Amino acid sequence: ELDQLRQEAEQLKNQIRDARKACADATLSQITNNIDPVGRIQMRTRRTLRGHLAKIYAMHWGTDSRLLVSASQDGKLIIWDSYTTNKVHAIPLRSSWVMTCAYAPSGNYVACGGLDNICSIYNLKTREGNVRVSRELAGHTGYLSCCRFLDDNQIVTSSGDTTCALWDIETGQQTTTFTGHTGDVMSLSLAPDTRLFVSGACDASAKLWDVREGMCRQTFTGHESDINAICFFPNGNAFATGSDDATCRLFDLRADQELMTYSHDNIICGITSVSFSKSGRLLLAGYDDFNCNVWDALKADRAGVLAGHDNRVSCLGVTDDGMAVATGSWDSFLKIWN
Amino acid sequence: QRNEEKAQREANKKIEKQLQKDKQVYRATHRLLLLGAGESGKSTIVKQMRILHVNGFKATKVQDIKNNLKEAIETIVAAMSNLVPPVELPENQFRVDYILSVMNVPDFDFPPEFYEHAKALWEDEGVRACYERSNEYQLIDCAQYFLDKIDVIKQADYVPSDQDLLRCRVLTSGIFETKFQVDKVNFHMFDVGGQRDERRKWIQCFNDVTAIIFVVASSSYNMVIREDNQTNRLQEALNLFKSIWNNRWLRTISVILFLNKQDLLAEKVLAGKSKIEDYFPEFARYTTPEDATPEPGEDPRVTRAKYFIRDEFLRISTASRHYCYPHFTCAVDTENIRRVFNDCRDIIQRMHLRQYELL
Amino acid sequence: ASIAQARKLVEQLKMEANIDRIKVSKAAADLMAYCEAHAKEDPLLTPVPASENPFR
Amino acid sequence: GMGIVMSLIVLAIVFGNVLVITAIQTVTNYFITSLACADLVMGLAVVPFGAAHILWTFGNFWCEFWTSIDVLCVTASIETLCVIAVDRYFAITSPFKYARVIILMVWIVSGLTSFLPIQMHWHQEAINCYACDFFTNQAYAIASSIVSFYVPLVIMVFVYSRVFQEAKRQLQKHKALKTLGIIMGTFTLCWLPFFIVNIVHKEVYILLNWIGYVNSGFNPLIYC
Numbered sequence: 001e002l003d004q005l006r007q008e009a010e011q012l013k014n015q016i017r018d019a020r021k022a023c024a025d026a027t028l029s030q031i032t033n034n035i036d037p038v039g040r041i042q043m044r045t046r047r048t049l050r051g052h053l054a055k056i057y058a059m060h061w062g063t064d065s066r067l068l069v070s071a072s073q074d075g076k077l078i079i080w081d082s083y084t085t086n087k088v089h090a091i092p093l094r095s096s097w098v099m100t101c102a103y104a105p106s107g108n109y110v111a112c113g114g115l116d117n118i119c120s121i122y123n124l125k126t127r128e129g130n131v132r133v134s135r136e137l138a139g140h141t142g143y144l145s146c147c148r149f150l151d152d153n154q155i156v157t158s159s160g161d162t163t164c165a166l167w168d169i170e171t172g173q174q175t176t177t178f179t180g181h182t183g184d185v186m187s188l189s190l191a192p193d194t195r196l197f198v199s200g201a202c203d204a205s206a207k208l209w210d211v212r213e214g215m216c217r218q219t220f221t222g223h224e225s226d227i228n229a230i231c232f233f234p235n236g237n238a239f240a241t242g243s244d245d246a247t248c249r250l251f252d253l254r255a256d257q258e259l260m261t262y263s264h265d266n267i268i269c270g271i272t273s274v275s276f277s278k279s280g281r282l283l284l285a286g287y288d289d290f291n292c293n294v295w296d297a298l299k300a301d302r303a304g305v306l307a308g309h310d311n312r313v314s315c316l317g318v319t320d321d322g323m324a325v326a327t328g329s330w331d332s333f334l335k336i337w338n
Numbered sequence: 339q340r341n342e343e344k345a346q347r348e349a350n351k352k353i354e355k356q357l358q359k360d361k362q363v364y365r366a367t368h369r370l371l372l373l374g375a376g377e378s379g380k381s382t383i384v385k386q387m388r389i390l391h392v393n394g395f396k397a398t399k400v401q402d403i404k405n406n407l408k409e410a411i412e413t414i415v416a417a418m419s420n421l422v423p424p425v426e427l428p429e430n431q432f433r434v435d436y437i438l439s440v441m442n443v444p445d446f447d448f449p450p451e452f453y454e455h456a457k458a459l460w461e462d463e464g465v466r467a468c469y470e471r472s473n474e475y476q477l478i479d480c481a482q483y484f485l486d487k488i489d490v491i492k493q494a495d496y497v498p499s500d501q502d503l504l505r506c507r508v509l510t511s512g513i514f515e516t517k518f519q520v521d522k523v524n525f526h527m528f529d530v531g532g533q534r535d536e537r538r539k540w541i542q543c544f545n546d547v548t549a550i551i552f553v554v555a556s557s558s559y560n561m562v563i564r565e566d567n568q569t570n571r572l573q574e575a576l577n578l579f580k581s582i583w584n585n586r587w588l589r590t591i592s593v594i595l596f597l598n599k600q601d602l603l604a605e606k607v608l609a610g611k612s613k614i615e616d617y618f619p620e621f622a623r624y625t626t627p628e629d630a631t632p633e634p635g636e637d638p639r640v641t642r643a644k645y646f647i648r649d650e651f652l653r654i655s656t657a658s659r660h661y662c663y664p665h666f667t668c669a670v671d672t673e674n675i676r677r678v679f680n681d682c683r684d685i686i687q688r689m690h691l692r693q694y695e696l697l
Numbered sequence: 698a699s700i701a702q703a704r705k706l707v708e709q710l711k712m713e714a715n716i717d718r719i720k721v722s723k724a725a726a727d728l729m730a731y732c733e734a735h736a737k738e739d740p741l742l743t744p745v746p747a748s749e750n751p752f753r
Numbered sequence: 754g755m756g757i758v759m760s761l762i763v764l765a766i767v768f769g770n771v772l773v774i775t776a777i778q779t780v781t782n783y784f785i786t787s788l789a790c791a792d793l794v795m796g797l798a799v800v801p802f803g804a805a806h807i808l809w810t811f812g813n814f815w816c817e818f819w820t821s822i823d824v825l826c827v828t829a830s831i832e833t834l835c836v837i838a839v840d841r842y843f844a845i846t847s848p849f850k851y852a853r854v855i856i857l858m859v860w861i862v863s864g865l866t867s868f869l870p871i872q873m874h875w876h877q878e879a880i881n882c883y884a885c886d887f888f889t890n891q892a893y894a895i896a897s898s899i900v901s902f903y904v905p906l907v908i909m910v911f912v913y914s915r916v917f918q919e920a921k922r923q924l925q926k927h928k929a930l931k932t933l934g935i936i937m938g939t940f941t942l943c944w945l946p947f948f949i950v951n952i953v954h955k956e957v958y959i960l961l962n963w964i965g966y967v968n969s970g971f972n973p974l975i976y977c
């Protein structure tokens with residue numbers, strides 16, 4: 001019966017926790033207490049991009065680290081030119097509620113999600129110099145939360161129906177399907193080699209799926225509240241998480257354990273987005289207290305503070321070459337730091 | 339080459355001109371959000387508002403009326419074996435097994451054989467006895483209207499009327515939105531209708547709507563939620579109203595309150611049967627407030643019941659920038675909605691918002 | 698029905714436990730080694746010259 | 754040396770007006786900019802007047818320029834408050850409404866009507882002045898006084914009454930009286946006595962003008 005089965009499930013959880021204790025040899029701080037502090041970090045707004053009418057919900061950088069795409073709550077995607085602050089396109093939308101955007105590695109397609117359950121995909125370079133909807137993916141229920149590109153013909157989504165699927169633009173059908181979460185899926189991030197990806201659920205848990213096989217590998221549950229953003233270390237063997245409470249942690253794959261916790265006693269707000277740097281030394285993290293913060297990956301101390309949006313930070317990103325840092329906000333403003 | 343720079347600047351100028359032109363429309367629109375519990379009547383208002391102010395408001399539609407008729411007749415007959423007290427009726431005994439056989443099938447009984455003997459079951463005395471107590475089992479609210487209209491739908495070329503389209507029930511997946519214009523000004527109203535969720539993490543997106551419309555059923559006080567034996571169907575709405583009202587994001591948003599199914603409530607009180615005091619024990623000591631404005635045709639007995647529901651909802655709002663507007667509506671009556679919205683608009687939410695600097 | 702659901706959950710959990718792990722000391726050493734190698738090629742830590750900066 | 758204290762005191766009027774100007778945004782906020790800009794010009798006009806009482810009139814042709822500037826500034830401020838009152842009341846009274854050019858209209862009306870004649874040059878005592886006392890006969894005042902104070906007050910008295918009535922009815926479906934008093938009493942007490950004094954046609958009349966220049970300065974705080 002269920003009582004016998006429920007006993008077996010509890011008879012295995014203790015084994016996981018007991019085995020994890022034996023793997024712990026020393027904390028991260030003990031092995032990294034003999035390095036020089038980075039020091040104060042200060043950088044100013046090099047450029048400001050304006051033209052949106054409502055709050056920005058997401059953004060993504062191009063592969064060449066020159067073009068970027070942003071999505072707003074009035075249903076407009078616009079592709080900026082970072083160097084000269086010149087708009088290139090302005091795409092109207094069928095539905096005015098949009099939560100995500102993406103930019104293909106080859107720079108030929110732009111995909112936007114939304115609450116309309118449709119992961120519509122656009123085309124950039126084509127005849128007549130016009131932009132039209134290429135395909136619409138509608139086999140999925142619940143509002144979407146992220147979209148990513150593996151190549152020109154594969155896109156991964158994640159919605160609030162406790163499901164993540166890998167699509168196929170040409171055929172327009174779900175190739176695989178990942179299940180197992182007990183809450184809404186909020187964000188995901190692809191590995192540097194595009195072989196694995198993770199997903200931050202709403203029940204204070206994070207998994208590690210496999211693109212080919214389609215099964216869950218591990219599960220980390222060190223948090224105590226909602227999870228809002230995830231990003232990978234540039235190495236590909238660790239990932240940082242930004243939760244609803246002020247804590248942002250850093251897990252490991254091989255060690256299968258949580259390593260360091262980033263928090264301060266004077267912060268009681270939420271977390272919106274996180275991102276690393278080129279060398280994986282800094283951990284930028286947005287906040288809900290009208291500005292941003294810069295932590296350290298090893299010393300775990302706040303170095304510098306980025307402020308000036310006058311409204312909550314809703315998205316964040318770092319270019320491929322690590323030359324600039326871009327942030328969005330809810331007051332129709334984008335900024336570039338350096 | 340400066341030609342590329344000139345072309346890029348020209349494109350930027352064109353895009354800026356288009357954006358400046360489009361900015362005017364966005365600032366001149368009012369956005370409204372519907373809310374409430376399931377099976378309350380949210381989508382009916384959206385469909386009706388199209389007919390009132392837009393000219394455009396069918397073969398595929400005629401399928402779901404037939405679908406509604408099949409579901410209602412199957413539920414009433416098949417649920418009798420599940421009622422604990424026996425009220426068993428021998429007519430159509432060979433047809434009861436037929437209904438059970440067709441109770442589960444992807445393809446409906448399009449053949450005219452099913453329609454012929456289905457009328458007898460509706461006219462059977464046992465079914466009417468079973469229908470008399472519909473609180474125990476879950477039944478569609480449009481059962482009586484369609485069952486009596488079995489003769490019209492049988493003939494070919496049905497061409498259903500607008501009134502018959504309003505009482506149809508079709509589940510909605512995505513955003514149900516409409517865009518109409520009232521005189522010079524224009525409006526934009528959108529449903530949500532995703533699925534029941536205790537968290538509702540998408541409530542952050544609606545942080546700038548002018549008003550939130552709340553719709554609650556008033557004739558369902560002796561039924562349970564779809565999850566059987568959960569709670570009183572009215573008590574599930576009261577809990578939802580309190581959570582929405584006391585939310586961090588919706589801190590400066592007014593709420594318009596609608597109480598639908600007034601005709602259903604009026605009929606329930608008149609013909610005895612279940613009493614409110616059985617389910618709500620505090621109603622026994624209630625006294626009608628002095629500032630009462632009953633409708634001319636309303637009997638004195640039913641006017642005491644209308645204001646008890648309104649008081650329960652209003653007490654939560656007044657306990658804790660915010661305002662609440664009560665109303666009495668009947669979504670089916672086409673002319674009825676055409677007056678409340680107008681009167682509600684009269685005392686504009688906007689005048690109050692502008693009056694904030696000094697009253 | 699649900700019992701199957703509990704049957705499927707325990708089947709998945711068993712394969713997760715039989716996984717290889719390494720000590721934290723041999724794991725935390727690699728991350729510290731990685732950051733020191735790629736420290737030079739990071740224009741965010743060490744400020745770039747105005748000539749090399751494309752944004753100014 | 755009381756004049757130095759008074760001259761230094763009115764020098765503080767430029768402080769607050771500049772800070773409001775520095776902050777600098779909506780459709781109505783553009784109209785409120787005009788009032789602040791004109792008042793700051795007031796400090797330059799006030800300083801020559803204060804020194805003249807202390808005793809000058811160094812400029813034979815510059816004596817009239819100060820009078821023209823003062824008249825233009827006063828009429829511009831009065832017209833600006835009339836415009837803002839009319840705009841607010843019309844917007845509040847009629848819901849669902851369906852700027853730079855307008856502020857320009859009132860400024861064009863002021864600069865012209867209040868400066869053309871004084872530069873233009875359009876009795877025995879006046880002849881003595883020609884050899885910085887201000888002497889107009891000919892009812893120039895009737896046009897300037899009527900077109901710069903009564904026409905503006907008459908518009909302000911009507912729009913504000915309708916707006917307060919619409920405020921008293923909505924509670925039926927206090928602070929309003931206090932705010933309306935703060936808006937109206939200052940302007941009335943600071944300008945209407947001067948208008949009464951001018952129409953009588955000298956130390957008293959000069960004294961009333963000296964008392965009234967500050968009211969435009971206090972204006973930045975009440976509107977802000």
Ligand SMILES: Nc1nc2c(ncn2[C@@H]2O[C@H](COP(=O)(O)OP(=O)(O)OP(=O)(O)O)[C@@H](O)[C@H]2O)c(=O)[nH]1
Nearest residue numbers: 376377378379380381382504505531599668669670
């Ligand atoms: N008799 C009567 N029926 C009504 C009235 N208002 C709504 N109904 C019917 O009751 C049902 C209400 O459900 P819907 O119209 O689907 O609205 P809803 O339940 O809010 O929709 P969702 O919750 O999004 O599924 C429909 O069958 C309506 O036709 C009313 O005043 N009187």
Ligand SMILES: CN[C@@H]1CCc2c(ccc(O)c2O)[C@H]1O
Nearest residue numbers: 823824827887894897898901962
């Ligand atoms: C005190 N200096 C002048 C004197 C006369 C005068 C003023 C303002 C408006 C008028 O219509 C006037 O006739 C004053 O500013």
Ligand SMILES: [Mg+2]
Nearest residue numbers: 381509510531
């Ligand atoms: Mg619906």
